Amino acid sequence: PPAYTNSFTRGVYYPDKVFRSSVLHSTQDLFLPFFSNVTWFHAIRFDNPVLPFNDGVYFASTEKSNIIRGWIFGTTLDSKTQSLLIVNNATNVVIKVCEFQFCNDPFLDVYMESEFRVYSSANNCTFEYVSQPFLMDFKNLREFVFKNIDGYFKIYSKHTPINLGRDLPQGFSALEPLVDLPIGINITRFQTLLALHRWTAGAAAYYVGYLQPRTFLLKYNENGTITDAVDCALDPL
Amino acid sequence: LQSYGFRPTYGVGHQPYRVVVLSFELLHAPATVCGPKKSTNLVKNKCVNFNFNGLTGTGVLTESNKKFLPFQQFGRDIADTTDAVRDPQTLEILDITPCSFGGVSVITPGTNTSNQVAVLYQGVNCTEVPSNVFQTRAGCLIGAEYVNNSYECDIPIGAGICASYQT
Amino acid sequence: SETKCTLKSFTVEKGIYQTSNFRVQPTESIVRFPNITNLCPFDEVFNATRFASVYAWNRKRISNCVADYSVLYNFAPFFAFKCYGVSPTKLNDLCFTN
Numbered sequence A: 001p002p003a004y005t006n007s008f009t010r011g012v013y014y015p016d017k018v019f020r021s022s023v024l025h026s027t028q029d030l031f032l033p034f035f036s037n038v039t040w041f042h043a044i045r046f047d048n049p050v051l052p053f054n055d056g057v058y059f060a061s062t063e064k065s066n067i068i069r070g071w072i073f074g075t076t077l078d079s080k081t082q083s084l085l086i087v088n089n090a091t092n093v094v095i096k097v098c099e100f101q102f103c104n105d106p107f108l109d110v111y112m113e114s115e116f117r118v119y120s121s122a123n124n125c126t127f128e129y130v131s132q133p134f135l136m137d138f139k140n141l142r143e144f145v146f147k148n149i150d151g152y153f154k155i156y157s158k159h160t161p162i163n164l165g166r167d168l169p170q171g172f173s174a175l176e177p178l179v180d181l182p183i184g185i186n187i188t189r190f191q192t193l194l195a196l197h198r199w200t201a202g203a204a205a206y207y208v209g210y211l212q213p214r215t216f217l218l219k220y221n222e223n224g225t226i227t228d229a230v231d232c233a234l235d236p237l
Numbered sequence B: 001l002q003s004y005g006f007r008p009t010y011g012v013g014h015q016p017y018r019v020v021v022l023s024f025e026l027l028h029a030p031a032t033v034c035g036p037k038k039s040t041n042l043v044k045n046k047c048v049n050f051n052f053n054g055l056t057g058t059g060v061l062t063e064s065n066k067k068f069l070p071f072q073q074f075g076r077d078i079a080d081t082t083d084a085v086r087d088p089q090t091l092e093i094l095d096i097t098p099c100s101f102g103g104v105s106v107i108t109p110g111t112n113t114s115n116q117v118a119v120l121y122q123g124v125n126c127t128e129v130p131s132n133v134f135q136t137r138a139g140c141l142i143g144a145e146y147v148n149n150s151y152e153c154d155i156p157i158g159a160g161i162c163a164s165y166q167t
Numbered sequence C: 001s002e003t004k005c006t007l008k009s010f011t012v013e014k015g016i017y018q019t020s021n022f023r024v025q026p027t028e029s030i031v032r033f034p035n036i037t038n039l040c041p042f043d044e045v046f047n048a049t050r051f052a053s054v055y056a057w058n059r060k061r062i063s064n065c066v067a068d069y070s071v072l073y074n075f076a077p078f079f080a081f082k083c084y085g086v087s088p089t090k091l092n093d094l095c096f097t098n
């Protein structure tokens, strides 16, 4: 069964790498619409679905442990066509775009930290990448936006400490870009990796929303940060 | 599979030649492995022709006081024109002021009075133009001496200044 | 004379007459850039201790780098060196995918 949550003003990211002073800039790009219904998945018993992409994904998560530990993107999630894999070790992220023979229920397996329960073939990858943090920089919300345009995968991320609330709090925080990968891959399906500790897990929960082509009006203050935005097709005001 | 020979006392034509075959292809990706752009140092406080990682333009480079967010390369002002960049090599923020300019007008009493003339360069500093070099506050008058007396307006120069044929 | 040319007359009465435009040209040029990064080592493929035999040849796929071909010009006389689709004097200013 589904379970929805109202995302009030979430998923506003920096559109370009340009400094702007106290300026109201009107942009038109893929944004998650204001006051929308994001889907609140649990996957905890263990049932994580293979969701579509369609135009980017806003992905929020509230987990103090390390369970939501990467993603799987692709078009058939099989061999004979390529697919992207983001795994997230304790020290570094390893993005890998190979012809993975993905298993039915993919998960990592920690004691030792193995990989053979995710896939079973790694033939002919043309892209590798290693960066340090990517994750974990009361509870802390972690928000990501993935969008694949013109062969470029763009991941935007922001990790913010929040108080106890609806896990998508009433406020505003702009998402700053993380990587920009030249993959050259058709991406239409994705799902999330987990770790299972060797069977038994904790309690996962992630919020998935979909980006749409919208016109926004962002307001940059003196220091070049975004403090407010207005969705030009929400209400009358 | 027959083994080669490769004794050292073979003629050139039976010697082991190593071979590397490079094959370049340009298939789909908008950006991949590419050669190295050249880099010539930058001059400060001079009107130069600049290129900052793709941004092509003209202007004077000066030390800035703006603060970019680690992911931003350049800034634009109101009216959407680039006004600051970050040097790719040294990672410093520099403002871009444009090369001075403005109209040039000639003040003449008429050839039936005299052939002298003075020239005002509108909001041009008298150090960036290329006797009597007065610096009005609405140009940069050359060819007339500025006095502290006052007379009736003759040839209006602008901003409460004037010129005229006297002695 | 520039004023007389602007008015298209030979008599210029009293007053400011706008004639021309003053624009400053730029001294020279300044192309600056970022230090450096990956250099996609040819060295390995042009200096291996054991080349593979001809029926079972290697195939190194070269990923993202800046590719200075000026090197590869410090190995010998190269009994050959035939570039086919490209001309070898222009290699340092082109982008390739694979």
Ligand SMILES: *[C@@H]1O[C@H](CO)[C@@H](O[C@@H]2O[C@H](CO)[C@@H](O)[C@H](O)[C@H]2NC(C)=O)[C@H](O)[C@H]1NC(C)=O
Residues within 6 Å of the ligand: B089, B090, B091, C035
């Ligand atoms: C790019 O490389 C240059 C190499 O010249 C770096 O410049 C040096 O940086 C160190 C660290 O602060 C200084 O101690 C040196 O004095 C600098 N060299 C000179 C000639 O001033 C530069 O910092 C590098 N930039 C980045 C972003 O890594």
Ligand SMILES: *[C@@H]1O[C@H](CO)[C@@H](O[C@@H]2O[C@H](CO)[C@@H](O)[C@H](O)[C@H]2NC(C)=O)[C@H](O)[C@H]1NC(C)=O
Residues within 6 Å of the ligand: C043, C047, C074
């Ligand atoms: C090709 O390989 C040889 C051997 O690895 C390199 O020779 C080395 O050169 C460096 C610097 O010139 C010396 O410090 C080493 O002692 C050398 N090693 C040996 C075993 O002689 C040679 O430089 C390589 N070619 C290039 C262009 O790097």
Ligand SMILES: *[C@@H]1O[C@H](CO)[C@@H](O)[C@H](O)[C@H]1NC(C)=O
Residues within 6 Å of the ligand: A004, A035, A036, A037
């Ligand atoms: C979210 O879902 C509820 C119930 O399904 C619905 O009443 C509401 O209108 C939805 N929100 C939007 C913005 O459509």
Ligand SMILES: *[C@@H]1O[C@H](CO)[C@@H](O)[C@H](O)[C@H]1NC(C)=O
Residues within 6 Å of the ligand: A089, A090, A091, A092, A094, A113
């Ligand atoms: C994660 O991967 C990197 C290299 O891929 C490795 O150095 C590191 O040890 C791995 N993390 C763990 C916990 O094994």
Ligand SMILES: *[C@@H]1O[C@H](CO)[C@@H](O)[C@H](O)[C@H]1NC(C)=O
Residues within 6 Å of the ligand: A123, A124
């Ligand atoms: C990668 O290698 C496999 C060999 O199994 C081949 O089928 C595939 O076409 C190769 N990928 C590309 C992009 O050529």
Ligand SMILES: *[C@@H]1O[C@H](CO)[C@@H](O)[C@H](O)[C@H]1NC(C)=O
Residues within 6 Å of the ligand: A186
């Ligand atoms: C990607 O999609 C486009 C259009 O949807 C299609 O033309 C192209 O063949 C696809 N590429 C692959 C590798 O499937």
Ligand SMILES: *[C@@H]1O[C@H](CO)[C@@H](O)[C@H](O)[C@H]1NC(C)=O
Residues within 6 Å of the ligand: A222, A223, B067
């Ligand atoms: C951010 O802006 C405030 C004023 O709104 C200022 O006091 C503060 O110094 C700025 N921060 C930085 C790092 O410049």
Ligand SMILES: *[C@@H]1O[C@H](CO)[C@@H](O)[C@H](O)[C@H]1NC(C)=O
Residues within 6 Å of the ligand: B112
């Ligand atoms: C200008 O010179 C002409 C003779 O060339 C004369 O007739 C006229 O009066 C002069 N004008 C003035 C203002 O002196």
Ligand SMILES: *[C@@H]1O[C@H](CO)[C@@H](O)[C@H](O)[C@H]1NC(C)=O
Residues within 6 Å of the ligand: B125, B126, B127, B135
């Ligand atoms: C012209 O530049 C000099 C410094 O070179 C400065 O002292 C002077 O005030 C400037 N004039 C104007 C009108 O700005």
Ligand SMILES: *[C@@H]1O[C@H](CO)[C@@H](O)[C@H](O)[C@H]1NC(C)=O
Residues within 6 Å of the ligand: B146, B147, B148
């Ligand atoms: C005009 O008077 C001011 C003081 O009001 C003085 O500073 C300036 O030097 C005088 N100009 C001339 C040309 O004497």
